[PDB]
């Protein structure tokens, strides 16, 4: 046999189907041949996010580190999640959320933002295709087309705008 209801597992000690506990609580007293499972709600800063029969709830991670925002509170049914604030990306990802936050790289003079930065990937920097420039050190500013002119005084490089 060993085929049980949904929200039930087969407790081998009791040789019978037993009800699981719900997200938000842990198994307090296990299955017996006579009575069923005895569940209890999770207490201080603890949780369970699945139907379970674990003896105690998981530990909510510590509070969010500097330059981080908590985008999800530790509840009885979910762990605390911390995210990087705008301008920062996630250097080192965690099981869920971000462990370490870093400042978005800067695209120096001559280099233009290739692709923007998400919360999981930094910004990619690389020079401009012939005919464009960037005299700005930015993590957002992209290569702009050279000025346009009748009199091409000084030709434009990827680092300075053309002169007229």
């Amino acid at each position: 046999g060993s085929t049980c209801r949904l929200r039930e597992y087969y407790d081998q000690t009791a040789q019978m189907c037993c009800s699981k506990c719900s997200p938000g609580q842990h198994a307090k007293v296990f299955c017996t041949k006579t009575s069923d499972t005895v569940c209890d709600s999770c207490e201080d800063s603890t949780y369970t996010q699945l139907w379970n029969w674990v003896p105690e709830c998981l530990s909510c991670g510590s509070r969010c580190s500097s330059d981080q925002v908590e985008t999800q509170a530790c509840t009885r049914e979910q762990n605390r999640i911390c995210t990087c604030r705008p301008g920062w990306y996630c250097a080192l990802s965690k099981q869920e959320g971000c462990r370490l936050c870093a400042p978005l790289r800067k695209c120096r003079p001559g280099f233009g933002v290739a692709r923007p930065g998400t919360e999981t990937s930094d910004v990619v920097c690389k020079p401009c295709a012939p005919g464009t420039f960037s005299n700005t050190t930015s993590s957002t500013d992209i290569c702009r087309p050279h000025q346009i002119c009748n009199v091409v005084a000084i030709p434009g490089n990827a680092s300075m705008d053309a002169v007229c």
Partner: protein, 141 residues
């Protein structure tokens, strides 16, 4: 089984200190092992496996050479003062982040009433981000 056993973990909500907890998923405190004043209390004579791990992390390196020490010490009934059983030291500094793991473990013969404690010199450098990073445990063999 019926063997004395403990695997206690760091309270992530007790920032700035090291407070062991047992009422957690994948944590153990049973078969006689007591947890009093943050130390483990052995239930019975026998050979025990004792282990512990701490994780240190800092943002940068201060103007002082920072040193990190981790020690499991024993207060035997047969010798009432802390005596180091297992111990290590580490040096992260000699603002990019650094992480320093330390593992300690070995088989020791203990006697009922023996107190075991796992301390660190720098609690303010402890890392509780994820689980399984800071723990302290024993098991009678």
């Amino acid at each position: 089984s019926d063997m004395p056993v403990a695997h206690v973990v760091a309270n992530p909500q007790a920032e700035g200190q090291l407070q062991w907890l047992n009422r957690r998923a994948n944590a153990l405190l049973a078969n006689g092992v007591e947890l009093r004043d943050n130390q483990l209390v052995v239930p019975s004579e026998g050979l025990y496996l004792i282990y512990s791990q701490v994780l240190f992390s800092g943002q940068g390196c201060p103007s002082t050479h920072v040193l990190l020490t981790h020690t499991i010490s024993r207060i035997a009934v047969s010798y009432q003062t802390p005596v180091n059983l297992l111990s290590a030291i580490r040096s992260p500094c000699q603002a990019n982040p650094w992480y320093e793991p330390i593992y300690l473990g070995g088989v020791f013969q203990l006697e009922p009433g023996d107190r075991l404690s796992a301390e660190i010199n720098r609690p303010d450098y402890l890392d509780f981000a994820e689980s399984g990073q800071v723990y302290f445990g024993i098991i009678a063999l």
